[PDB]
Amino acid sequence: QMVHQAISPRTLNAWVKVVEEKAFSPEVIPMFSALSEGATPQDLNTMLNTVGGHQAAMQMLKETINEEAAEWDRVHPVHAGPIAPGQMREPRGSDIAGTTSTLQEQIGWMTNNPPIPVGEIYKRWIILGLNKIVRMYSPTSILDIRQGPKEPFRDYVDRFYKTLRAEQASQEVKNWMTETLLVQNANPDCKTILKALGPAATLEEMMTACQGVGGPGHKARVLAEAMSQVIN
Amino acid sequence: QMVHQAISPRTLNAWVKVVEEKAFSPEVIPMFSALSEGATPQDLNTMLNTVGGHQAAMQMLKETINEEAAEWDRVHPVHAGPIAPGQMREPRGSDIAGTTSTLQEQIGWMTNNPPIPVGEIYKRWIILGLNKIVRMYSPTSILDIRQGPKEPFRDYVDRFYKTLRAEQASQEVKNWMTETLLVQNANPDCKTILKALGPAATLEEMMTACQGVGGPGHKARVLAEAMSQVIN
Amino acid sequence: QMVHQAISPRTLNAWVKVVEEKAFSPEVIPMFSALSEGATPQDLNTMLNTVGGHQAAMQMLKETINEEAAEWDRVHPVHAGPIAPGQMREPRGSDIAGTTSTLQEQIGWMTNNPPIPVGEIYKRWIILGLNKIVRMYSPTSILDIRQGPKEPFRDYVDRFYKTLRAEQASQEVKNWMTETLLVQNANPDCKTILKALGPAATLEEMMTACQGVGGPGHKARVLAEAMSQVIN
Amino acid sequence: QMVHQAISPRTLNAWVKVVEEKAFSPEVIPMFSALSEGATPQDLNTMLNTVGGHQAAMQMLKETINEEAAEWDRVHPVHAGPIAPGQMREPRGSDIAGTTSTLQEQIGWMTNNPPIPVGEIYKRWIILGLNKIVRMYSPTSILDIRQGPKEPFRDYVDRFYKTLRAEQASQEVKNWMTETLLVQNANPDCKTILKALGPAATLEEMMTACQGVGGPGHKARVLAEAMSQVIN
Amino acid sequence: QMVHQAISPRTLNAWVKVVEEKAFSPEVIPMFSALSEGATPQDLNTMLNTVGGHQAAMQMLKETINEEAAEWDRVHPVHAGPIAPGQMREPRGSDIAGTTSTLQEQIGWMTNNPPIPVGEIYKRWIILGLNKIVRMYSPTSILDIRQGPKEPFRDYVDRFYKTLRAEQASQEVKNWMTETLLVQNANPDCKTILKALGPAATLEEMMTACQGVGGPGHKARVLAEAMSQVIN
Ligand SMILES: CC(C)(C#Cc1ccc(-c2ccc(Cl)c3c(NS(C)(=O)=O)nn(CC(F)(F)F)c23)c([C@H](Cc2cc(F)cc(F)c2)NC(=O)Cn2nc(C(F)(F)F)c3c2C(F)(F)[C@@H]2C[C@H]32)n1)S(C)(=O)=O
Ligand SMILES: CC(C)(C#Cc1ccc(-c2ccc(Cl)c3c(NS(C)(=O)=O)nn(CC(F)(F)F)c23)c([C@H](Cc2cc(F)cc(F)c2)NC(=O)Cn2nc(C(F)(F)F)c3c2C(F)(F)[C@@H]2C[C@H]32)n1)S(C)(=O)=O
Ligand SMILES: CC(C)(C#Cc1ccc(-c2ccc(Cl)c3c(NS(C)(=O)=O)nn(CC(F)(F)F)c23)c([C@H](Cc2cc(F)cc(F)c2)NC(=O)Cn2nc(C(F)(F)F)c3c2C(F)(F)[C@@H]2C[C@H]32)n1)S(C)(=O)=O
Ligand SMILES: CC(C)(C#Cc1ccc(-c2ccc(Cl)c3c(NS(C)(=O)=O)nn(CC(F)(F)F)c23)c([C@H](Cc2cc(F)cc(F)c2)NC(=O)Cn2nc(C(F)(F)F)c3c2C(F)(F)[C@@H]2C[C@H]32)n1)S(C)(=O)=O
Ligand SMILES: CC(C)(C#Cc1ccc(-c2ccc(Cl)c3c(NS(C)(=O)=O)nn(CC(F)(F)F)c23)c([C@H](Cc2cc(F)cc(F)c2)NC(=O)Cn2nc(C(F)(F)F)c3c2C(F)(F)[C@@H]2C[C@H]32)n1)S(C)(=O)=O
Ligand SMILES: C=C(C)[C@@H]1CC[C@]2(C(=O)O)CC[C@]3(C)[C@H](CC[C@@H]4[C@@]5(C)CC[C@H](OC(=O)CC(C)(C)C(=O)O)C(C)(C)[C@@H]5CC[C@]43C)[C@@H]12
Ligand SMILES: O=P(O)(O)O[C@H]1[C@H](OP(=O)(O)O)[C@H](OP(=O)(O)O)[C@H](OP(=O)(O)O)[C@@H](OP(=O)(O)O)[C@H]1OP(=O)(O)O
């Protein structure tokens, strides 16, 4: 037969925009519940594959799906023997998840009498994964990258640029983030030097200027400055 | 047959109260999805017709529904004509939306074997529309009606009263809104005159007092006052 | 037959965690609808019985379910006559709610041809109840217990400890709550006395110290001190 | 038959990441050319539908595809006469674009003898559209929203918030953008007032303070201050 | 047959409330012993699945159950051959715990002649696990999160918020904990700066103010302050 509730172009685009705009806020759960309703496991897998970024969250979701597939296998014993020509093989957990089943097999299960709603079972597994992601997963934010009090400036710059590469933004916005946040979120010892450097300093000049922060000479110099302030 | 999941009086009232209390915040999407499950397209249309105000949002929803009906028609080719006497005509997008189908026809599709869940397909279309509304539609608010720096006071009053007529509130709250926000949200040039006029001033008196703001006489008078302050 | 959408261990645990973490915030409505889909009324009742605390909310939910069951009974007239041996009895509202139906009967209704999705009907009833709870139910909070201006300190302490017993917290957190909030949220008249007592004062000492607040002696003493300030 | 070059989950995810990371820089053209080679028009349409945002760009692509389909229809004259039972209908432009053709028909055209590579023809059409997008389409940027010299502060705030809603960023990043760019990109006349307000000022306070900029009172006041400097 | 001592709704709710109120104080052991008496392994598994939080404790309980099942398998040799039609398979350790057995099999074992009380055997295994939890498991407490003498403020804040997410409390109580405990439980070096910041400081301002504690400039400054106190 055919699946009447196969996802339309606008449904898939709406799911993509939901993920892009809300990330994994709780609102993702009702949206996925409504957009994916009635769809085959193949359509749900398409929706899950359209998620860009958030690799850790998607790995969490995959682990949850595997656990639910194992639970399905535990609750459904394997039947050994020759299947009737009219009948078809009973779904397994991987068949529900669509890893070992074709679209035709999923449609056959969904439209059989009695029907096995493999799409809705898979949808509940995905919802469990999404709930786990919403509770536990925190996406990396370029706004959260601050230099540690004893962290070398080079290591902080490496962390900043790694997070910026992972950041969801336009390239112009990422350039503006580099121009604003990097010096702003440095630790005070490095920030003093960076401000003394001036606004026109390049990244290499900034990195050379802070290369000694925490070394013997810089420590002695700041200690001597503080002691001179005290004596005066 | 009969639809076991037809909307109850409490279900319809809950949907009405959801729309009235939350407008089109994201919470409207789960509630609708929960409140309309297993209902016919007729019940869904009844739920949609109970939305008071937000006419622009309802128009956006209608456009989304029409687009989804067109997609359904594209995916489902029409038949040649030999309809089986026992069988019924296959639904079109308009039939899914309930514009060209009766309640009996929708029930027949829903309870047929194999079943066509016309209600659930229509629900998915309505959810797509509601998502578009939540993302893109902003209801007019009496709170953000402010007089422009060069806007005539009469035009501002007309805008304020149009928004107030569109506002969801009781008549007493609307009167209090008129007494409070109209003078508060005027521009400084008109606001000074209104303050000098006194609380007892009526709408006609305020409008007459502010009729000359921005004209040559008022501009000359304010410029002369500023010049006199400068000279002194 | 067999129900393929029976709640798994992780589904039940997710529902328990949702109720514990979110109480009855609106997020409870989508989560329930997602976790409970396809389940029998028995699984729905299991989830409902897993709710610890919020007894008034659960009474509201029960009242809503009874009203929906009455609506179902009104809509479905009871038919007199012996049921066919192949057929089963038509469900009543109590049967959908699972009070008067066994799991076997629920599964038979859900997997019959034509099917009666008693699980989905009951789910919508529970959603109506949950929506009513979210709208109208506010859980008691230990943070909200504050001594009235003329309330005896003993009555305030009784209310505080009752609310603390109802509070969802660990014993250590409850002890810290007692150490912090009880004196903090006392009225000024008792609060000056409690501060004068000192940090080491026990509950009995605090209750004895404030036992006279509002009595003729305390009123006369505070009036005398105020008059001393005035005539100073 | 079957299509061996159907897009894999990783191929689709790579396309999604390309669009999210590069927007429509020229690099999109090689990536799309390489990721979509040998795919059916259905897979191509899926990839096109996973593009979030850039609605004007997608409309441009749709117009280019429609014009290429019209060119195909011009070049290939529709032949009148029943098709051979072994043969299949020749594809039209809409068939290559996938609007009026099913996946089975596309596979039949691609795997026929002689083959009609509808996937590759559609790929070239999409590449033409993408080239037009890369040359002529500029995405909106929140960094580009600056208040005009005579623009009311209300209108500038409206434009800023519309562009921010359209911006591809996390909610925290959008909040930081509101905190940073709105006052920064205001015109000098509003900017001096906003600075005088202080950092703690809310949006409504900022919007009330600038409500009179450009009005007769503000014009007179600034002219008076300038004349005070001159005649000093 | 049927299990006469299947857990009632009130039994399950009482178990949930026991775990919520008491966590894993020794009182859990008698309560579980009394609530679960006579129940099938399926019912006990339900009770264990209703435990929210304490995931480490539940993992310990699962390990104890697995060890007891292994001991059962060691003591009960596997019998190979054709089971009598009137007889059922002898239970294994996994069958006692209900992982590889169905409710029907458990009821058959429990009601057979001679009976195998699989529920009570499983109950003793669970009691052993609960005893191990009571002796060894210590739940995380937000009250126990204190900043180390050399710990960066950002790391301490991250630990605090992780523990707060795991804490059993209402959201309002968690907000109160954030407003009270975080500054209170910081180390003295950070607490001095935080107190100098003021009561209205946000989390970002607090993190910025302590970003340099332990860095060279801060160390020099505090050493200079101490030396100045000594010289004076
Ligand atoms: C052809 C088509 C119709 C199809 C299909 C199709 C078929 C099956 C599956 C699949 C489903 C369930 C499981 Cl449980 C496993 C599995 N279990 S396993 C042995 O442990 O790995 N493997 N698969 C791969 C399988 F089946 F091919 F083997 C799956 C997918 C998933 C959908 C999915 C994506 C996701 F993110 C998280 C999920 F839980 C499920 N997509 C992938 O898995 C590829 N992926 N994975 C991960 C990650 F690791 F981060 F989670 C990532 C991707 C990514 F999308 F690139 C993206 C960056 C993230 N799609 S179409 C048009 O969509 O292309
Ligand atoms: C008999 C009965 C059970 C029925 C039915 C019934 C049947 C069909 C439809 C309908 C459904 C879908 C489409 Cl797609 C079209 C269509 N497509 S079209 C060619 O472009 O216009 N037309 N219809 C009219 C049709 F079918 F009659 F032709 C429809 C409605 C809609 C329900 C609906 C309301 C809505 F807000 C938005 C929707 F998307 C759908 N209600 C209307 O449409 C009337 N409406 N419209 C608009 C607006 F334009 F602002 F959105 C407004 C109304 C309003 F309610 F007054 C309210 C102020 C807003 N109800 S009942 C309840 O009466 O007793
Ligand atoms: C055996 C099993 C499979 C089962 C079942 C099972 C079967 C039926 C029902 C039931 C369902 C619907 C109605 Cl409408 C009535 C009814 N209508 S009536 C004549 O007016 O009272 N009675 N019942 C009892 C019936 F059926 F026995 F008669 C019900 C329950 C409910 C589920 C439920 C819980 C709830 F909170 C609110 C609900 F709306 C429904 N649970 C109870 O009712 C016991 N309960 N009640 C209340 C309260 F009063 F606060 F709401 C409280 C409990 C509590 F859980 F302790 C908790 C503190 C709160 N469970 S299992 C594994 O789960 O144990
Ligand atoms: C079921 C499935 C296999 C399929 C399919 C499927 C089938 C066909 C088409 C399609 C292809 C070519 C043309 Cl030439 C037209 C057409 N020509 S016409 C009469 O002038 O409009 N109509 N269609 C709709 C048709 F065919 F239904 F009629 C098409 C699509 C396009 C793919 C596409 C996307 C795109 F962005 C630009 C394109 F050029 C083509 N997707 C849509 O069209 C929906 N869309 N449109 C636009 C816009 F208008 F902005 F461009 C937008 C969308 C959006 F994705 F939401 C996104 C925000 C942007 N997908 S699956 C798993 O992928 O869902
Ligand atoms: C359908 C139904 C009747 C049933 C059943 C049902 C059937 C079996 C089991 C089970 C029992 C014994 C073992 Cl010895 C194993 C096993 N041994 S193994 C190969 O090493 O992992 N696996 N199982 C899963 C099995 F059998 F399905 F494979 C089990 C469970 C357990 C009950 C249980 C919970 C628990 F906390 C600790 C236990 F010791 C036992 N529930 C789970 O296990 C799922 N779980 N696990 C863990 C953790 F890992 F943290 F401990 C957590 C959960 C959680 F509940 F989510 C919660 C957060 C914590 N329930 S119902 C109405 O209740 O849903
Ligand atoms: C004779 C006098 C009493 C005094 C004594 C000497 C004097 C002085 O020192 O005070 C020299 C300066 C002047 C001439 C004043 C008179 C007033 C004028 C005036 C206020 C006149 C109104 C004019 O305004 C416009 O044209 C309106 C405007 C918005 C610019 C438009 O139309 O585009 C401007 C240009 C703003 C001038 C500035 C110069 C001065 C101060 C004189
Ligand atoms: O629009 P504004 O900037 O607020 O000022 C305008 C405008 O001056 P601008 O050139 O700065 O825009 C007019 O144009 P100019 O003559 O100065 O070039 C001017 O005179 P005209 O209208 O005769 O051209 C006069 O306009 P008005 O006659 O209405 O006073 C004036 O004041 P307004 O703001 O009130 O328009």
Numbering used by the authors:
A (entry chain A), B (entry chain C), C (entry chain Q), D (entry chain B), E (entry chain P): 9 to 240
Copy text verbatim from the article accompanying this structure deposition.
The Gag polyprotein, composed of MA, CA, SP1, NC, SP2, and P6 domains, is the sole viral component needed for the assembly and release of an immature virus particle, which is accomplished by the oligomerization of Gag into a lattice structure at the plasma membrane. By contrast, the immature CA hexamer is stabilized by both CTD-CTD and NTD-NTD interactions and adopts a more extended conformation with a six-helix bundle at the base of the CA-SP1 domains, and the immature lattice is stabilized by NTD-NTD interactions that mediate the inter-hexamer contacts.
Utilizing PFO-treated VLPs, we obtained two BVM-bound immature GagCA-SP1 structures, which include: (1) a 2.10 Å resolution structure with both LEN and BVM bound to T8I VLPs; (2) a 3.09 Å resolution BVM-bound structure from NL-MA/NC VLPs. We utilized the PFO-treated VLPs with either LEN or both BVM and LEN bound, which resulted in a 2.18 Å resolution and a 2.10 Å resolution cryo-EM maps, respectively, with virtually identical GagCA-SP1 conformations (RMSD 0.4 Å). Our high-resolution in situ cryo-EM study revealed a well-defined BVM density at the binding pocket with a local resolution range of 2.05 Å to 2.4 Å. To better interpret the averaged density, we modeled six symmetrically related BVM molecules inside the cryo-EM density (left), which was then compared with a surface contour generated from the symmetrically placed BVM molecules. The succinyl moiety is in the proximity of the K227 ring, which appears to adopt alternative conformations to interact with either IP6 or the BVM moiety (described in detail below). Remarkably, the combination treatment of both BVM and LEN demonstrates that the two compounds are compatible and do not interfere with each other.
